[PDB]
Write a protein that binds this ligand. Sequence first.
Ligand code: F43
Ligand code: F43
Ligand SMILES: C[C@@H](OP(=O)(O)O)[C@H](NC(=O)/C=C/CCCCSSCCS(=O)(=O)O)C(=O)O
Ligand SMILES: [Cl-]
Ligand SMILES: [Mg+2]
Ligand SMILES: [Mg+2]
Ligand SMILES: [Mg+2]
Ligand SMILES: [Mg+2]
Ligand code: NA
Ligand code: NA
Ligand code: NA
Ligand code: NA
Ligand code: NA
Ligand code: NA
Ligand code: NA
Ligand SMILES: [Zn+2]
Lengths: 247, 548, 548, 442, 55
Amino acid sequence: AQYYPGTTKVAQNRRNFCNPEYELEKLREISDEDVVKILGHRAPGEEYPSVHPPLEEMDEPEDAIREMVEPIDGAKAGDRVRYIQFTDSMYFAPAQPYVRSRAYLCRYRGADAGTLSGRQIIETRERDLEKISKELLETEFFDPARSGVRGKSVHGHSLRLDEDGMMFDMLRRQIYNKDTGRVEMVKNQIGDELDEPVDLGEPLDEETLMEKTTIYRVDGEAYRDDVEAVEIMQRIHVLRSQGGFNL
Amino acid sequence: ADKLFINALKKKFEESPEEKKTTFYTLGGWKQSERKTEFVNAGKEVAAKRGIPQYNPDIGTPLGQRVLMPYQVSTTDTYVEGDDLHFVNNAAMQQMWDDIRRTVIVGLNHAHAVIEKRLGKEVTPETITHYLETVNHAMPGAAVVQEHMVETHPALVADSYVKVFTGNDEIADEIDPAFVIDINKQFPEDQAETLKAEVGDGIWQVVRIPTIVSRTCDGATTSRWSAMQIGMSMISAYKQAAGEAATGDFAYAAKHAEVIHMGTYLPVRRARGENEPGGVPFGYLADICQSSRVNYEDPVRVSLDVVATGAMLYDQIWLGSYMSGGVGFTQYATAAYTDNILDDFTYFGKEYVEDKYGLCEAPNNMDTVLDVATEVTFYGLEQYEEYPALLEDQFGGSQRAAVVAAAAGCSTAFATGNAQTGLSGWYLSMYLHKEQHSRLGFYGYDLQDQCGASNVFSIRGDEGLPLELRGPNYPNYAMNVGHQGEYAGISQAPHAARGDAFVFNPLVKIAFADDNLVFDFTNVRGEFAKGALREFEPAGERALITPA
Amino acid sequence: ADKLFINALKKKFEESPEEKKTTFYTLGGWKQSERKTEFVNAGKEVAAKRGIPQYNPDIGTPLGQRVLMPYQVSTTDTYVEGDDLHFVNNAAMQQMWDDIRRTVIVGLNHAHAVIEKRLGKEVTPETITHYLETVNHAMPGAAVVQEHMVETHPALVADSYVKVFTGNDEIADEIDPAFVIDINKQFPEDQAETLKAEVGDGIWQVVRIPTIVSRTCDGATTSRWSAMQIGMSMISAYKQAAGEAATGDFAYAAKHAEVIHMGTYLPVRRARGENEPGGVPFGYLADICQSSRVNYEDPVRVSLDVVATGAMLYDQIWLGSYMSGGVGFTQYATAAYTDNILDDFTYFGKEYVEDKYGLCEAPNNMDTVLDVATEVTFYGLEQYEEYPALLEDQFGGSQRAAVVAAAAGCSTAFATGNAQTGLSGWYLSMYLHKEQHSRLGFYGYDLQDQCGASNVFSIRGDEGLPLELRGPNYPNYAMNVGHQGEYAGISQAPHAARGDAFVFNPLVKIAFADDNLVFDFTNVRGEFAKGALREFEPAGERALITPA
Amino acid sequence: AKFEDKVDLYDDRGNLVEEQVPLEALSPLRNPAIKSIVQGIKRTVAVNLEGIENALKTAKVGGPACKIMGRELDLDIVGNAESIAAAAKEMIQVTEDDDTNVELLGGGKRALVQVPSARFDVAAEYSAAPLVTATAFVQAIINEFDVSMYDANMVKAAVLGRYPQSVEYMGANIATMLDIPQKLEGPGYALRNIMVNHVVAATLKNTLQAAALSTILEQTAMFEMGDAVGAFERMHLLGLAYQGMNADNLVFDLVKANGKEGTVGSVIADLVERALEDGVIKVEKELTDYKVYGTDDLAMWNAYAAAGLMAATMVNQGAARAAQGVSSTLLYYNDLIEFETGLPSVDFGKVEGTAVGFSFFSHSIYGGGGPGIFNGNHIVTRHSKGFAIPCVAAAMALDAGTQMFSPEATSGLIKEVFSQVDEFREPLKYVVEAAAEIKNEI
Amino acid sequence: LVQVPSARFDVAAEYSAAPLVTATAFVQAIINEFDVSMYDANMVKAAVLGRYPQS
Ligand code: F43
Ligand code: F43
Ligand SMILES: C[C@@H](OP(=O)(O)O)[C@H](NC(=O)/C=C/CCCCSSCCS(=O)(=O)O)C(=O)O
Ligand SMILES: [Cl-]
Ligand SMILES: [Mg+2]
Ligand SMILES: [Mg+2]
Ligand SMILES: [Mg+2]
Ligand SMILES: [Mg+2]
Ligand code: NA
Ligand code: NA
Ligand code: NA
Ligand code: NA
Ligand code: NA
Ligand code: NA
Ligand code: NA
Ligand SMILES: [Zn+2]
């Protein structure tokens, strides 16, 4: 598949995030327990709550679609549907809101993705969410200065950075340590205090943010200068326009 | 020389507008704000008097971790906190809607034919004047026929009255001038000539019912209240029996056959009667705004005064209260009338078009749409990229999308002189913007914009319509902020560039050219600023009938 | 001794009430009246200020060739000119409608199940109290989640709040009592037992949105506004994602699945959304009135406080403005709540029934209808014949028809304990009255009264309904004064005689048993008198945001 | 003979039933089984006799929490249901041998009623179904127990609710799949105002039958609205065939190839490849390492894309066994396919747009709800002309219990009665057979 | 005078197919007769069916 037109680094990055055969760069190590803590849906060692009985205990209708479509593991178990949500700075965060939803539905099964200017969200069965969330937190989907894990009070995508280069957070969930040059998560995504903070590593430097970003900007690569990408967007406009009048 | 929004950015922030970094968290939260401090103290007093907790700054999350900004009202030198532009806290905004809701336009053409052909009596300028003196006693709620009637207090209903207009100058001159909207006084010469030719010898009433009644009741009250007192005044002034068979003809004429509502009624899911915001079509909203007759050498200014009118009414009062409620949608609308931002982008596009094509001289086709809307969209988004203070000001993607596309769509219509290619330019802007920043608006912002391109030129049943006839009930438009007010601007755009006196209905245009209105429709942004400063005096208050 | 209307007739006229002749034409026209004098003076000032003629006593015919009467508000010692009971001039009347329009009842039963089953979280008395502290900050229009929100001024919205009630005493005891409508405090013991049994362990919110918003917008705003702020407070108090799939279940529950509107929407000819007067059924209007819980040993007082409530709302505001306008219908309604006249006729009827049958002990059949309705009709009509002052007071035939039939219908329902036989009595009263005096009401008064007998017991699609379920949109009742408020009284009558705690909806009954309302629903005629005297202080005024 | 196209038709197990069927043999205008389903839905009513009985005994009539103290009536309605239903049938039928059907269910607690076709032949619309049924049962109950003139109005309130004070049958103990004519968002919309949960309830959660019923109803409405007249007729017919009727087994085969491990994106890749293989699309221009595709047949491209969209829903929401993400699939299937190809998405952007607002109004405070409460007449989901809602029905059919407002909660009475009707429960089988039967008449 | 075929109403819920089918057929026929452009054809729609769907 070709995913996206264009001859800039931005356009290549957009293609790479969508392509499930592209191995995302891993930038930080996070424990299983710390993923569970950041999500905030259950405590480490607490059983997954259920919303309905396990599929094998229920009597399904005879249905060829059900037979052909394998359920994800959390669906087999009856897990709750829960979420993880990120905000991405317009100052060169690696992933951005439409890049995320487009990539999520190329890479992940059984996904409900939503795109907004200041927040992007995925909802899926709880045990599967925990596995997806490890990849979203450990790889170049995330930078701990220019991205944030936020289930509420999301303001910041469009704001100026602070003096450390961190994005604004009304609830200050991610704290830059001047002594290490690393960021710690001190609260879960809804803003409650963690017993012990989670190391999220060093922010990417300016040159690496430029190499990996998927936003177009005049001080980066501008969209107007990706003429093949612009051409396809204008094509779609014209053909949609003609099609609504006649075929 | 400077971009038009630079002064406002310098007022808001200590940093220069191009700086990428700032300081947060040390502003004292709500205590940085004069307005929030007033609210905290008022919440304490309210809860104490009534015995139930109310406003409390410590509920939920703590506002003011960033700068709580002042906003410049565009075209003015007034700076206010955003709370002063909320429709609940702004009497100008409330009175703007009351003046539209309590207005109806009602012919006298069928009525005069009833008098002449059915009653066998003469109609002249003098009989019309006697009728108008009568109806200006009756319309506010007072009697002309029965004994022992009890009546409205004239000071509570001082804003209710009836005027007329006609395109025949010699007839207009014979009706007492206290009751006439004078087209030659209110409109520049070429616009006056167009409007009088449209009206011809027709004679039309502009009826305004009391604000205190509009507030107690609803919009669908207006044409009924108008018709009852027209009916009584026809009886009194022309000597009918007080209630005979011909009386029903005046009722049917005033309620149905020669009535022009401001808004049509809505379907059951959003059930409302006539003269509610959702029934007002975009071409009528542009014609209600009276910028066209005062700022006719500046088509940008005319178009953006319409945007302000529509963003406030359609997003703050209509979508933000009638269709939802609570804190609501103040800054989704303020983005289109504050900081001179939309003004900067739209003047750029007007200049671009004038230099390449000449206003109204571009081919009316997709080649022009692609050219102009692409150019202006790239201009606007570059400003947010060049000035970090600008992006922090218009912090919500939906705000930026509506502002940039309004400039693109208005500019495209300045080139072609046609609203429909303007609208195609609006949708193209959204699609370019979404790809440039990998984001556009809120979760549901581009429902209409993804349907948009295909539905611009469609001719199908619930799809095809000239933009001037569309409104808040066009199916794709019925739900979401940051479009409806801007579409009224695009509807105005081509007509402002062409020098047209009106966009969609010449009667509506004349009806708001009346100095006896409470709100001043020639300067909508100036009025919003006056109400924000607590200097606007509305009609409808009950001080006279309540304890001192 | 004296009939109950004698004191009022003596205050109105120099003659004893029995005298048949008087003097006219030499009272000085409008100059006899303090209030008309006030109006003439106001009209001159208004006209001069605005440059357009307005109120003028020399237009049409000359009021006041006969005595312009004072009216006693029944059950009070307050006497006022009738203009002081016009809804435009009476802030108590306007606030009565605002208090109903701005109220919605919204369960927490589905909401709490979403929390426990879909989110997997706990609900307790403590989490409910926290939720109620949150929603009492948010509901008036203030923020709980987002940064840089702008908010309503707390003092402009001081009348908006949320309370709860529940039939479980132990749970009610655990919630902060500031937020609780206490059923054991507000209702006498036997009524409290009934109401708590109806509610059971359900928990219901009573939500009142701001009067200022209800006046700016419409009734259909209320359940939307309520739902938005319930939705935000659920997110904040229970730690949802701020916008996930489950958020939609709270919206559908609050807007549709567990909402009780005060009124349902209307058909297109009279198009209106929810919570407008024409959608409020008679049974709910009786339960909104709170006379039942304070005057329970007097079934007449309870029934006629309901008549007063409905005659004002349905004839003055609804039929006299929403559905028409102008001078309108003040005295068509005042006939049912002034001079102690309906009270005298209905106390006679109750005494007849008590002595002959015992309240609620008559057979529920046509034999009882013919007995009681005929006897009370003849009593009422004989008073007009024996007291010429009474006939000149209630000068319009429609007024007398409504008053006599309301006594007849209420007294019939006092005997049978059933509203439908009360309604049959109302129609029989009209037929007897028409034959006795060879007149009844205005030209179109008995459209419903000639369809009446046949539709009382019909079961057909748009004909058959128990009276408690009928209202202003029942087809026969959709147009005319002097019926709707009396029907609400007949709906209350059998329930008051039985000692029932409610007429049609126990949730509606409890929802108005609330001392934080602006209008006092326990003493409706008391409040109308306070409003007439310009002593009532309404919500909704803009004085804080306007110039001194 | 207006269009040359032919399709192969399959059953819900992926087996070929009838080859080379002229496209217009599936048109609502020509196919007798579509006519029978439409006329059936107009004339069928469910009656809740237990609910009528309980409302009367408690005096709880006229809407939520409403009661009239002192009006209680204790009638043995369910115990006498056979006699009551026979008496009702005598009033509902026009003649003894017509197509009136009245059938007791649940030991007399419920009744299935189908009002005779002759009443609809001289009617403007469809309201004769509920109104004729309600008055026949009101009259039958009164006559069964000799209910007095004084009390009979309570039986009316128990059956049809607060109507005519309310516009709707508020508090009624009867139900239909259609809703009143006043609630249409525009003329021609009545077959769109059928709740997704009602379709899923009637088809017993069989995914392909639910998709079929929803598509037949939506595309039939497109003819009534005039959208499928003239230039656009072929596009709407190809949409019905490929998206709702599994034409050429394209939906079925895309689900088969992507069900074990697939995603939305993998279904897209398969559909583009299939369109190329069949000659529907071809490379028009080469950019830098990017092929721009073109087509000489936009209506066929749209149909292929629509089949992909249905399969993508089945794969995505099927893997979660959770319907909520259908709003996401509807959006990003179309968004992704445009940047994959250079061709317009399904319905020329209107599915994507419907999905944007449907996502918002199923994850926000402002309105909507779960997927099962939407329908083609809902303000949020009316915009696409038949290509969105059938995917929502498939998604809710696949939901294993994640919804509070499920078909079990909203549609229990509809499920018990309407699933008894074979053409409503299994429409795919009947429409295919009819198309085969009229194939040589085209 | 136009009478829309009975077969359209046999598969409709009500009667609005008459005006809607007739209006679109005449809108398309007029556009086709004069080769009215994509930019201007929405005026033909407004002249035949009015302000619908705003009203
Ligand atoms: C809970 C929701 C989901 C819901 O359906 N609506 C909310 C909340 C609601 C509330 C917030 C009031 C409160 O704070 O108590 C109100 C005011 C509506 C109401 N009930 O009165 C609102 N949204 Ni919201 N909402 C807005 C905005 C937006 C932007 C904010 C992005 C930013 O980076 O800050 C995003 C959408 C986007 O990403 O594109 C957004 C989301 C959301 N919006 C997320 C909360 C986001 C977060 O957790 O912080 N709004 C805007 O973009 C600007 C205007 C602003 C509205 C108020 C106004 O117009 O003045 C407000 C309009
Ligand atoms: C013009 C009509 C016909 C029409 O359609 N409505 C009228 C007039 C209208 C006007 C009179 C206002 C004014 O004088 O300018 C208003 C106030 C409605 C409005 N437009 O505000 C009214 N009637 Ni009328 N109308 C009334 C009534 C009545 C009684 C009055 C009988 C008499 O003996 O005085 C008769 C009907 C009847 O005979 O039963 C009547 C007729 C009429 N009613 C005859 C004029 C009668 C005349 O020439 O004097 N009303 C009444 O019966 C009491 C209440 C009274 C209403 C005002 C109030 O409720 O306070 C008023 C209600
Ligand atoms: C959709 C329908 O609601 P229903 O599904 O409950 O009928 C309909 N309501 C709406 O259309 C609501 C419209 C205005 C509120 C939404 C404006 S979009 S601006 C907020 C975006 S965000 O700030 O939350 O991200 C109604 O009739 O009440
Ligand atoms: Cl084609
Ligand atoms: Mg590890
Ligand atoms: Mg004497
Ligand atoms: Mg005597
Ligand atoms: Mg038995
Ligand atoms: Na500065
Ligand atoms: Na706070
Ligand atoms: Na609704
Ligand atoms: Na005296
Ligand atoms: Na006079
Ligand atoms: Na009407
Ligand atoms: Na003031
Ligand atoms: Zn109002």
